[PDB]
Amino acid sequence: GRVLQDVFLDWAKKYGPVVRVNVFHKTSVIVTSPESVKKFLMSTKYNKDSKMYRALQTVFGERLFGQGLVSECNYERWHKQRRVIDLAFSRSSLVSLMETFNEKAEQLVEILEAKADGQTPVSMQDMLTYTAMDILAKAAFGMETSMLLGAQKPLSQAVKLMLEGITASRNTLAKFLPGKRKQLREVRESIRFLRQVGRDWVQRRREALKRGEEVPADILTQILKAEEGAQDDEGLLDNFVTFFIAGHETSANHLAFTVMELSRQPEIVARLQAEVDEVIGSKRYLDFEDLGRLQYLSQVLKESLRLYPPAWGTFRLLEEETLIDGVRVPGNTPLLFSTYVMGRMDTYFEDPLTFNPDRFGPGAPKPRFTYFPFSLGHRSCIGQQFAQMEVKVVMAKLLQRLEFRLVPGQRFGLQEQATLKPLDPVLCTLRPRGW
Ligand code: HEM
Ligand SMILES: S=C(NC1CCCCC1)N1CCC(c2cnc[nH]2)CC1
């Protein structure tokens, strides 16, 4: 139930705000003082370290995220893409996605209700992954993956294998073990499979447009626009993969962690249920303004990201020798900023292991540069609002309609498969609730 990030936490607790650690077998310095987080993340003077993002660019030799929006480290090349794709994330575009978030969240609840016999185990990690994928495929690409209907198992498996491969490739000796040759081939096959799905969905979009079919603008419209000037489609496919994975798997892990922790927090669940009952009652469709009224649910989701941030770290390149909190750090060193580590430091959060949504209550002092599950600054998550809205819609509907009980034996530990996620798949038994 322990992960590599816990060793970084141990080194930070032992040695202070600036500590040399080994990550992806490269030397890095983890920086955990709030003033240093602010200095480096809030200035465009500091950019991502390409050496650390190579683990996403290519995996076991096969191009995966390439130079898409997450893994492009050059400021100019990144900014050019960001400006174009930001258009797909305006307040108005997001509100137009509430129909999609409601539709798939209601579909999830209806499937779960059909399974809510109080004894059959349901993997909530898998069900939330299927819901997040069906939401992203429709909202971003205008496609129906229907994973909630049991379709596209090869695609869901390919995603799982490549995320495991990201972690294996950057931390293990798999590339040299004869026993792992099959595993490496299957990771490379899964990465090529996903880029070829991108080729198909891109062709479907171009053909629909060529036939004069109506096509609302979405994320795919902007990733196509960002590549207008391109020799070929590899850059476009990098952003297809980037948004296909980032736009569903991290939200799914956040939802799974929240369901896992809430299963042992009856008092908190009672308040959430009462809040949903008072705010949305038996309404079928949640409105944008409804979400803002679910104040305690927002607190709960923020506390879930403090203790269980799926995207656990970000790196900036320190180009020249610099004194950081009194420690002289050599030039060309990757600096690691980790919301996972800071969230578990008693220096920044009293009784860090206690799950207490009141840390994010009205009037509570806001964490200052000690909490950043979507990172901060210019390279912060372009999908933050998309994610916060979709997770709230799914959680509100689950709280309205179902009661969960974790299957005895399921653990509360973590595992790393690119991002952090529950070690166990959050197997639960369900019963219908309320109206
Ligand atoms: C709870 C869910 C999510 C979490 C915790 C999260 C977290 C993050 C973090 C920490 C970063 C910074 C990564 C880095 O510095 O290496 C980031 C970047 C990014 N995220 Fe998310 N994310 C979430 C959901 C999403 C969604 C739903 C999308 C897409 C629709 C998305 C798209 C992206 C992209 C494209 C970037 C790169 C932004 C840039 O550099 O311009 N994220 N996210
Ligand atoms: S494993 C990972 N980063 C690690 C490897 C590259 C260096 C930083 C840590 N990431 C990038 C961000 C990505 C994401 C961004 N938004 C949702 N998901 C999830 C996968």
Swiss-Prot record:
Tissue expression, as annotated, is: Expressed in brain. The mRNA was broadly distributed with higher levels in gray matter zones and lower levels in regions rich in white matter. Not detected in fetal sample but its expression increases linearly with age.
Q: Which domain of life is it from?
A: Eukaryota
UniProt-listed GO biological process terms: bile acid biosynthetic process; cholesterol catabolic process; nervous system development; progesterone metabolic process; protein localization to membrane raft; regulation of long-term synaptic potentiation; sterol metabolic process; xenobiotic metabolic process
Q: Look at the named UniProt entry and state the broad enzyme category this protein falls under.
A: oxidoreductase
Q: What does the entry list under GO cellular component?
A: dendrite; endoplasmic reticulum; endoplasmic reticulum membrane; postsynapse; presynapse
Q: Which cofactor does it need?
A: heme
Query: Does the keyword Amino-acid biosynthesis belong to this entry?
Result: no
Its pathway is:
Steroid metabolism; cholesterol degradation; Lipid metabolism; C21-steroid hormone metabolism
Q: How does it sit in the membrane?
A: Single-pass membrane protein
What function does this protein fulfil?
P450 monooxygenase that plays a major role in cholesterol homeostasis in the brain. By promoting constant cholesterol elimination in neurons, may activate the mevalonate pathway and coordinate the synthesis of new cholesterol and nonsterol isoprenoids involved in synaptic activity and learning.
Q: What PANTHER family would the database entry show?
A: CHOLESTEROL 24-HYDROXYLASE, CYTOCHROME P450 FAMILY 46 SUBFAMILY A
Q: What is this protein called?
A: Cholesterol 24-hydroxylase
What organism is the protein native to?
A: Homo sapiens
Q: What is the lineage of its organism?
A: Eukaryota, Metazoa, Chordata, Craniata, Vertebrata
Gene that this polypeptide is encoded by: CYP46A1
